[PDB]
């Protein structure tokens, strides 16, 4: 028997909607605060397989959602493949040396997962133990364009005008850059499958920065580069793309040939299910911010999305992470009333 | 004879779509950057008329655009409104006793903007004056919820948990307070239009934090009022709804009664025009970031945009405002190729 996350999303027939909060944050539990405050800040956020496998976990233990997700910075990666980075207080990310040319470019190594984050693979099998079946285990990473913009613009962007600049000035350096991304991310997509991951979650919100016709330029291809060739290698392994602020992008999301969308809330569940298209699956729709109203209002809201997004291919979740301040209550509230939903 | 504009918004014929970017920041030509060194901040950024007038005229000089828009921090009225609030330097703008209940909201005062902002009213006479109906002179508002938004957060907000936790836990005082804006947001627009506004552009961006029932119950029917009033009073003025990251609202916007709808670019204008229904105006769809490419790129960018938001009911501009390290040449190009557009 496969969990209930991963025959909704086959579209297989299923008696509730699978269900799981995003952001699970160690930082919500007050759990990797606690970790966080014990030294390392690079080795302490998304590093260590033990501190991976409790902030990961995390959610898992309080609510037993239907998903449990891998928690590693999509930028991981970075290292190994050559691009230097690290997490300054308060800066966050940071790219030592931006890449800029054609020649920087080429300095870009192949990401080996294997060998540059064994703990990932690990992490990964060792939560896959823990929720033995009763949840699938999802995997993380961060996609070709969103990746490329952390690379070029230096770090976190609010304007993105360096990766513009270079999209719109140089297109043929980006789209070098986007390709490296592209093959190296499909590949960690295979390790994290091979290490126990039942579904692998594409991070890439930064591309709904772009125009719908530069969506289908710089981010677009290089989505439904990984998602053909992962298909090709590992055929029933379900992808999710999460990009918020897709709201003008829906109809092209679909064409990367994911198997499950993950909307946020700015577009109504009913009208997501109509602009996706029928065959696509849908990951959650509810608005962080409802969370802080009253429990009524917060049934109400979980009953119109779960009404409008049909009687299967969904998996209940927020359009995005969880507030920092939300009630812890108004959160057993949700699982409370989203567990008890019977198609 | 009429402004370009105004006839293309009007749905007049027009032998090429009318044009102006936003932003236009004193800051982007360094004229407010040399007048805010001079003292009063608070004074300094949208309040004298000279300061205002110079601010506001600031494109209207090197580039002549077809629509000129008030240099006034939509805010402003918070003071007359018996709001007390200021603009703290790396805060930005602080309200110091946000809004929480019923009884706050029974405090809040019906703006008079000829008490209270006449110098707003004597910047568009004089501005009226200047460009000398060879541009069209538009005002600027706040709406409602955007309004309600920044009193109740105390300030700019991220999260806005705030304001939602007030809408879904507390409608009626919210809604209570959206009718205060509502009903002084409209006088105000009276105000400006009496002063030599031709078309007020109504900002509620922060709406569009809404999931689209919520945007229904909270923004929507408070822009509606507006719009039906004003258009009592004021049958012929245009009036422009902006809000930013609405693609997922677009269906809903026009509901509003708006005579323009300002698209952003992440919404592709063919799309946009769809959505929208064929009545309602489309303001300028191009995204900042593209003035950072080859002229070339500019050009079909804005070429594509004319092309699919149709031949007339257009103002060509932006999506958004003009990136603050946009070379001015790129922009200089943008209006050249823009001018010399006939359909």
Known sequence: ?????????????????????????????????????????????????????????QPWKVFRPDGVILFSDILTPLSGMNIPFDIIKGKG???????????????????????????????????RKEVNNQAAVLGFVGAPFTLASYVVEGGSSKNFTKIKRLAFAEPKVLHA???????????????????????VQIFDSWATELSPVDFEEFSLPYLKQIVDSVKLTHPNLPLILYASGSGGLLERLPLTGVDVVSLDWTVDMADGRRRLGPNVAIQGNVDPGVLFGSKEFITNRINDTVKKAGKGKHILNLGHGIKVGTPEENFAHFFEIAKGLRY
């Open 93 to 127: 990310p940071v790219i030592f040396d931006p890449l800029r040319t054609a020649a920087d470019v080429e300095k870009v190594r192949e990401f080996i997962p294997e060998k540059s984050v064994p703990y990932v693979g690990e992490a990964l099998t060792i939560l």
């Open 177 to 199: 850059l986007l390709q490296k991304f592209a093959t190296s991310m499909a590949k960690y997509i295979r390790y994290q499958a091979d290490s126990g991951a039942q579904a």
């Open 1 to 57: 028997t496969q969990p209930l996350l991963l025959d909704a999303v086959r579209g297989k027939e299923v008696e509730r909607p699978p269900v799981w909060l995003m952001r699970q944050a160690g930082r919500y539990m007050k759990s990797y605060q606690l970790l966080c405050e014990k030294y390392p800040l690079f080795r302490d956020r998304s590093e260590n397989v033990d501190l991976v496998v409790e902030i990961s976990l």
